[PDB]
Amino acid sequence: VQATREDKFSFGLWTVGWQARDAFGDATRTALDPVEAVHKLAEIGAYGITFHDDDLVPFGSDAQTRDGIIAGFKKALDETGLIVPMVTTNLFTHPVFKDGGFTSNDRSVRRYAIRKVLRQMDLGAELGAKTLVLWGGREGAEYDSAKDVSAALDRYREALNLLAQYSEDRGYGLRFAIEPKPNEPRGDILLPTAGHAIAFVQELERPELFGINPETGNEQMSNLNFTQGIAQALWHKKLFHIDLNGQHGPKFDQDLVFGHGDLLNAFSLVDLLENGPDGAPAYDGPRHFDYKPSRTEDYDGVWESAKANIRMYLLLKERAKAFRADPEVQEALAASKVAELKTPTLNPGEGYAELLADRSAFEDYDADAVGAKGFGFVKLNQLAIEHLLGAR
Amino acid sequence: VQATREDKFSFGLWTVGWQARDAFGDATRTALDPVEAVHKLAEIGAYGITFHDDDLVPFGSDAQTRDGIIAGFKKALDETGLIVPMVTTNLFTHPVFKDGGFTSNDRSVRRYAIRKVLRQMDLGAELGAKTLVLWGGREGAEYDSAKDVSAALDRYREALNLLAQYSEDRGYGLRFAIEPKPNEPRGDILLPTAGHAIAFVQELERPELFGINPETGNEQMSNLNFTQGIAQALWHKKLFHIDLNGQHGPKFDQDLVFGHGDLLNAFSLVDLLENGPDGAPAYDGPRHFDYKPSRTEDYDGVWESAKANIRMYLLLKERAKAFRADPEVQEALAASKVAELKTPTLNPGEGYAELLADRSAFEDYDADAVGAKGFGFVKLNQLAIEHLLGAR
Amino acid sequence: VQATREDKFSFGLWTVGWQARDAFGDATRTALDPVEAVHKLAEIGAYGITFHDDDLVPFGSDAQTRDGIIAGFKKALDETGLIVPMVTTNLFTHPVFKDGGFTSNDRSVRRYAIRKVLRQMDLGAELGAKTLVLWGGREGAEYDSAKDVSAALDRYREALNLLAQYSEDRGYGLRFAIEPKPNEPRGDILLPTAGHAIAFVQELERPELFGINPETGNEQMSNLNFTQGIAQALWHKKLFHIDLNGQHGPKFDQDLVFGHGDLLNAFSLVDLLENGPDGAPAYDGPRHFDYKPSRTEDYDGVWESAKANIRMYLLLKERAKAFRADPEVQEALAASKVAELKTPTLNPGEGYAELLADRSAFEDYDADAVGAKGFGFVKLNQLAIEHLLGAR
Amino acid sequence: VQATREDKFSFGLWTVGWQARDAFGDATRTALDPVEAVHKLAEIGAYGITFHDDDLVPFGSDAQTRDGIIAGFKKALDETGLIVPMVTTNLFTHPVFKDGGFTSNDRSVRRYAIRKVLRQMDLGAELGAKTLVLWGGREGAEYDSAKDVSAALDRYREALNLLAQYSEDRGYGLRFAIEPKPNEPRGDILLPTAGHAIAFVQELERPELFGINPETGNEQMSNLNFTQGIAQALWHKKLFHIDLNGQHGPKFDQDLVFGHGDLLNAFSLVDLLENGPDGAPAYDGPRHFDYKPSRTEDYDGVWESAKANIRMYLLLKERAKAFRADPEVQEALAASKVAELKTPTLNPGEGYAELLADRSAFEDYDADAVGAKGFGFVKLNQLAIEHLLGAR
């Protein structure tokens, strides 16, 4: 197939730009020029590009240089037609953030982190970004006695309340997406799962401005079901953005191409995002790839890997649709009673009083006869997989 | 040390009563009489007992049978002075619940599940229970296409709203605690972590009546930090109850005695619960042990294991107290700046305008100098362990 | 694609016959009759059936009874043309085995464990079985001080040496396949991975007679690469049998249909076993499915799930073949230097003296230049996945 | 407690010397001078130091520089009395090793990797090192089709056989210790566990010169029982060296201080190594710490953490000793029949025929009566923890 701008494939500058310096070895690739990145991505089908402040403008650049870079960057976007759907801030690389940005034990670091983000909010607003992604990679601890979690949640809230205030007053119209991750680089990161992140956002001052940006690999690092967590996020209406990549369970963060880790879960995820209610997708934001071309690769492997993300999503999309359109699948869904879950448990107007009065729901209920009937889930799963293998 | 009623140690009838039939073998113990369990627990210092409907009254008992069991039960409670602080319903054993209780794809099962629960609420209210724990062990899936999560969450919510209604109408004054679990017995369970359950609870009709009942091993099954998720539950004010046990990371549910799994996390958990703000505990509900005496033990090992739970908690509490009263630990805490997180990041009355104006927060911030200061976290962790080891 | 006797699909009596009684619920299916199972399996294309002693002949059947069952069984075999490639012994269900069979702390259980196996050996011999699978599910511990590992290995060895002695004296011609598992039912099981089992076997008296029976799911419970461990087993020539099934990382043992868990690894595994050395398979034994039909299924679901196992294998085989025959794959394999690994590092007749004299292997070696060339591994991976999805 | 040279505590130069540049941030500490490291370690009680070739001599130093550095290092050891018990080679940092050293698909890289190691073997021999540790960190893959595991194992073997040939011919008398790791930095590493490494070594030409160097966190990254694994290594007599550190289950490689991760396992481990047969340790080599001072620390934090390792080991030893010495433990050990596993299952000269003729081992055996006696394991376990906690 071919990607269109309507597919909304976006990529971070730090993805195809990863030089491949890992925890145990030096970079295997030279630095990628941002203008070139814009051009290359435009060519493979991306509709947008994203970046951390520090990906674009080197940490500690004078005003002149910074200005210079931005203006060149704006031209490339101009020329190519790419947009900046989201921007983010680096609060994890510099040594000053070793104990965190917003929740550093050190108060002067917290104040500096806020300043660094306000500044990226301005650049973001100016480039037309709609979302501010917040990844607290250094928020957490290696040792339990070293971090007061309650105080850290207070300080986290205190910094987000301010960012919302500022954006609303400046009229930027940004939405904020918190990105949860269980560990790496901290032994334990605060807001470890999509769940913890949604519960937190609900405690903010203007909760309607906050949602989450879950990443496939992050939830899998804890062995959780990504598709199911995204279905919960959509139920809550907090799916503000999504980071797509691959991972092979609980181990270091692999950042593989989307669908190169848990293939069965990548299939069910594409199905959930696209075969939404009223035919239409359940999710309309950017399909953003936050992955890394393997360290064994050169620049050709880099563009190859960029294209693989797109091809994986589109091949899966194609099979998810065929799946839903199959009459045999339709028959299996019916036998499994998948849609019966959508009909309320109670008849319209029934409350506990009427339920209590229904002998058929308890006193005369034959739990044994009901318990003997199978749901046909295995057959239903086998049909999904045969669709994924292109065997039907 | 010795447990007092003020310690509020409680046990489920199903813990000391587990006959040890596992997934690969037959029971190794004969059944425990509930009256005998009441007497034995009182004797080791428990203040309360809890139970699933089916633990006390065999599934399908006629009303005469059920009434007799209940009356002998109440007499035992009376005579020993033990109370019933929480009650729960078995929605996982019978074959009828193979696809869940409240979220089974089968509508009639959903209606029966609610009636089973209503009946237990009446019995709980008559025994004086203040909490109803809800463990949706069968709510979930083994295959992604078998379960519509969104419909499932709608059905879950629909059942819970009715229960709150009935309780409030009957004046039962119950609080509801959802217990999260990532998997086992379903491949993937809905509301997998304390975070997911808290975010869900926030969407109910009367959220104030709902909180969570997190279990030590449950979060460890996902390799998450239990103390840190409890800290967040406390921040939201949703810690309605707690299940204490041991686990060795991601593997089947072990249900070891509390402290026999991740000792260091057990230590920091006891510190958090008891050394709360204002001298006083941060949590005041029951300290409930939801564990299982190992399959290798006989009834002597069963009572030894019940006593081990209480001993473990009291020993850790003693060491947590000494930890905080150490002037050396206090000095390490000050050097690591733990308490400085409790100080707002913004000055009183400062807003973004004033922050933007503070050049010390950015323009004149020496990131590099701050970045080089150590936090002394290792040293702090070392003192903590020396206290646990009784080396200090 | 249809199954042939040449495909060698075998199933354990206990897979399709699993009543779905789990750690938290009652059985949802009635007992399956063995003659019936033989007939049904013959029908779906299985070439063979396997069983634990206790799956066929109920624990404690008198000789008359036992004798009667075997005769019926043999007749069913006869009629369908099904063979018994392997037999095993249940050393895990009965309470006497709660601390192990061969390595129980109790000397009398150890003695009984050996007698139980000798007896099963005679029956296997009688039915023509070639392999004796030994799954030490109860060998291990929940607490480190409870089991002397060293002594346990001595006793595991002592027992196996005796079995081989007996087999050899009697002329049975059996091969012994140890089955590794990291945990469940025990907190930790002795010989936890394929590696630990191979290393152990190398220490017995007649090692040539011993190998392993690795199970997909068991390696995945530790997050290990199953394909990669099978490659190493093949390298040692110790792959005596294989148990195929599915799993979703580290959590309780799921026993899904082969390919329903880690699909990508299921693909690379079939490629490994079938696209062997000549053109021929690298593995010639039974393709044994050790799975469980999900608890939500009735007998229709059971037969569906049996068929699904065969279907997944044949579908993956078909795509593995196509992958290797693609000229584009050939090209990608050439660019990745896969085959270059098969060429010895040293030239024929070269030793350390010659290597040390080669200035080009070090002194004049341009590591920087070599380190800049890509291996093109992502692209190769992408072609593999496209073959899997029937996209090529 | 005080460390003595008889304690044999060693530290890698790369441990205390780790500049804290992780996968997400820049170094937070300046470079440590080898000579200074030697003086500091000597001072905290270490008896020896280890290093990777590239830790002491910057990759690419001329012989003049190289020589100068060796000379000074040699002086420092001289003055302090420290020895170099082990040396290793860096076959993972430089980009040339992106696909491995010994198993790179590129033949030239393989030749180069051997030369790099021969050279390090020379320096090791000159400094009196007895063990060459081989950590194949880059041997493995991210994708299944990229690496022929069989070919890889052949090439790993080819390289190792040459190394033993050389050492034996030069009369260096070195022992080779393969260090297993499941993942990080490759998606999956060859020889993922202590078990796989032991099985592989048994296939070399001179197997008696080869053993393993297992690392605490490496086995815990797969959620394996480190103590049980060491016990097996000891049974095989392949425990040639050991790397001690801490980890919190399956997540990135943390490298915490020894005992700061799974504390209960750290305890059973010291008990295993120290309370060997007849009072004497079961292990005689270096007690080597391969850990990292947390990124949040400064040089103060660094020295602290170095001492914490010694401290932890000595506190644990002390409690392990007391545990075993407690007549109450002694009594619980007896009741749990731990030592009964040491008695052969078979009587002296007893074979299959005498066992088959013994009615008490089967025919007349009361499995039900034996199946009901408890092992008293929870109680023994609770006694161990109370010793650890200093409460006994």
Which pair of tokens denotes residue D62? 């001329």
- Superfamily per CATH, domain B1-392: Divalent-metal-dependent TIM barrel enzymes (3.20.20.150)
Question: Is residue D94 flagged as an active site residue?
Answer: no
Q: Which residues of D touch C344 (CB under 8 A)?
A: 154-155, 158
Among residues D52, D241, D288, D387, the one annotated as catalytic is D52
Residue B256 CA to residue B291 CA, distance in Å, equals 6
Task: Round to whole Å and give the CA distance between D92 and A23.
Answer: 10
CA distance A372 to chain C (A): 6
Type of residue numbered C330: Q
Q: Evaluate whether A87 touches A120 at the Cβ level (below 8 Å).
A: yes
Beta carbons of D162 and D111 less than 8 angstroms apart: no
Closest partner residue to A385 among C250, C259, C373, by Cβ? C259
CA atoms of B332 and B336, how far apart (whole Å): 6
Selected residues 176-235 of chain A with any CB under 8 Å from a CB in chain B: 182, 188, 190-200, 202-203, 222-225, 227-229, 231-232, 234-235
Considering the candidates A7, A53, A55, A243, report the single residue annotated as catalytic: A55
User: Does the distance separating the beta carbons of B251 and D249 come in below 8 Å?
Assistant: no
Strands (DSSP E) contained in chain D are 9-12, 48-50, 86-88, 131-135, 140-141, 175-179, 188-189, 210-212, 243-244, 287-289
Q: Mark yes or no for CB contact D114/C224 under 8 Å.
A: no
Element at B189 (helix H, strand E): strand B188-189
The CA-based angle D235-D237-D239, given to 5 degrees, is: 105
* Contact criterion met (CB below 8 Å) for D301 and B377: yes
- Residue in this structure with the two tokens 């990532």, named with its chain if needed: B182
Cβ-based contacts of D254 with chain A (< 8 Å): 142, 187
| Cβ atoms of residues C166 and C127 within 8 Å | no
β-bridge partners, D157: none
Cβ proximity of B356 and B302 under 8 Å: no
Helix, strand, coil: what percent of chain C each, to 5?
A: 50, 10, 40
Q: Which of D119, D155, D223 comes nearest C341 by C-beta?
A: D155
Closest CA to D378 of A314, B289, C311, C190: B289
Structure tokens at D267: 């305890």
Contact C172, C121 (CB under 8 A): yes
Is D210 within 8 Å of C129 (Cβ atoms)? no
Note the helical H segments in C281-373.
Answer: 299-325, 327-336, 352-357, 367-370
Q: Pick the closest to residue A59 from A12, A84, A96 (CA basis).
A: A96
Instruction: Please name the residues between 227 and 266 in chain B that touch chain D, using a CB distance below 8 Å.
Output: 248-251, 257, 259-264
Residue C372 CB coordination number (10 Å): 16
Question: Please, are residues C134 and D321 in contact by the beta-carbon 8 Å criterion?
Answer: no
Q: Do C378 and A312 touch (CB under 8 A)?
A: no
Instruction: State yes or no: is A106 an active-site residue.
Output: no
Contact list in A for residue B160 (CB cut-off 8 A) is none
Query: Which region, left, alpha or beta, applies to residue B321 given φ > 0 means left and ψ of -120 to 50 means alpha?
Result: alpha
Please report, in angstroms and rounded to a whole number, the separation of the first and last CA atoms in chain A. Answer: 19
CB burial string B372-392: b at 16+ within 10 A, e below: bbbbbbbbbbbbbbbbbbbbb
Of C317, C214, C222, nearest in space to C267 by CA: C317
Partners of chain A (3+ Cβ pairs below 8 A): B, C, D
- Residue D81 contacts by C-beta under 8 Å, 6 or more apart in sequence? D5, D42
Tokens 């239903």 correspond to: A380
* Nearest residue to D211 via CA among D222, D200, D220: D200
**What are the structure tokens assigned to C30, written together?**
């009635």
Interface touch D248/A93, C-beta < 8 Å: no
Nearest to D74 by CA among D38, D118, D119: D38
- Contact status of A166 with chain B (Cβ, < 8 Å): yes
Are B376 and D300 within 8 A, CB to CB? yes
Which chain B positions have a beta carbon within 8 Å of D257's beta carbon? 378, 381-382
Partnered with residue D87 across adjacent β-strands are D132
> Which chains pack against C, by 3+ Cβ pairs within 8 A?
A, B, D
Distance of alpha carbon D129 from its chain centroid, rounded?
16
Resolution (A): 4.1
As beta bridge partners, residue B83 has B48
Residue A336 · residue B105 · CB < 8 Å: yes
Supply the angle between the helices D107-126 and D149-170 in degrees, to the nearest 10.
30
Instruction: Please tell me what DSSP assigns to residue B313.
Output: H
Write the CB contacts of D316 (distance below 8 Å, at least 6 apart in sequence). D259, D266, D267, D269, D270, D388
Least CB–CB distance from A151: residue in B106, B250, B341: B341
Residues D253, C143, C245, C322, CA torsion sign = positive
Give the DSSP letter string of A274-307. Answer: HS-SSSS-S--S-EEE-----TT--HHHHHHHHH
Which contacts of B308-311 are long-range, i.e. CB under 8 A and separated by 24 or more positions?
Answer: B308/B257, B308/B260, B308/D378, B308/D379, B308/D381, B308/D382, B309/B9, B309/B11, B309/B244, B309/B257, B309/B258, B310/B3, B310/B7, B310/B9, B310/B44, B310/B45, B310/B46, B311/B1, B311/D382, B311/D386
Q: Which residues of C touch A322 (CB under 8 A)?
A: none
